[PDB]
């Protein structure tokens, strides 16, 4: 179905994981992809602004293997209930990234593959209808350099 959002999710999570020294390979087995670069900078900036107003997102929620999934869906649903904009989509990515980074630090590597899967499915089922009806992913690159 060419849901290449998977590639976007993995690319973003790999970047966040690489920052902490890990590799995406450890947890899981037309070249206009400047969105990859655009999303990384955006994610970095979001986390920077978030960690200034509050504590960094990596220490916001207390996670356990059995708590993770219900906690992820609960957050995302409340984030997108009153509307969808490009800022909240960046919030969506940097949140999932913070979860992966935390889950590894708290030694719950099992979640990393799933967080990606959780993000990818929601990005296909509930967000892409908004994406191309707002100009696709390039529009994001244009508006946010």
């Amino acid at each position: 179905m060419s849901q290449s959002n998977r590639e976007l999710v993995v690319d973003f999570l790999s970047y966040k994981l690489s920052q902490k020294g890990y590799s995406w390979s450890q947890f899981s087995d037309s070249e206009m992809a400047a969105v990859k670069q655009a999303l990384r900078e955006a994610g970095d900036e979001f986390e920077l602004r978030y960690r200034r107003a509050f504590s960094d997102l990596t220490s916001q929620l207390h996670i356990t293997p059995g708590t993770a999934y219900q906690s992820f869906e609960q957050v995302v649903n409340e984030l997108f209930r009153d509307g969808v904009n490009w800022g909240r989509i960046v919030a969506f990515f940097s949140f999932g990234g913070a979860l992966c980074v935390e889950s590894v630090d708290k030694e719950m590597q099992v979640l990393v593959s799933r967080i990606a899967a959780w993000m990818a499915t929601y990005l296909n089922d509930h967000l892409e209808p908004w994406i191309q009806e707002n100009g696709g992913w390039d529009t994001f690159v244009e508006l946010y350099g």
């Binding site: 978030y50 107003a53 929620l61 609960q74 957050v75 409340e78 904009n85 909240r88 919030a91 350099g145």
Partner: peptide, 21 residues
């Protein structure tokens, strides 16, 4: 009983004001 919504709102607070690139 969720502190998850508080996180979602904190996310929205920065996300909403994120149009000023």
């Amino acid at each position: 009983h969720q502190a998850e919504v508080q996180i979602a709102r904190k996310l929205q607070c920065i996300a909403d004001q994120f149009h000023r690139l």
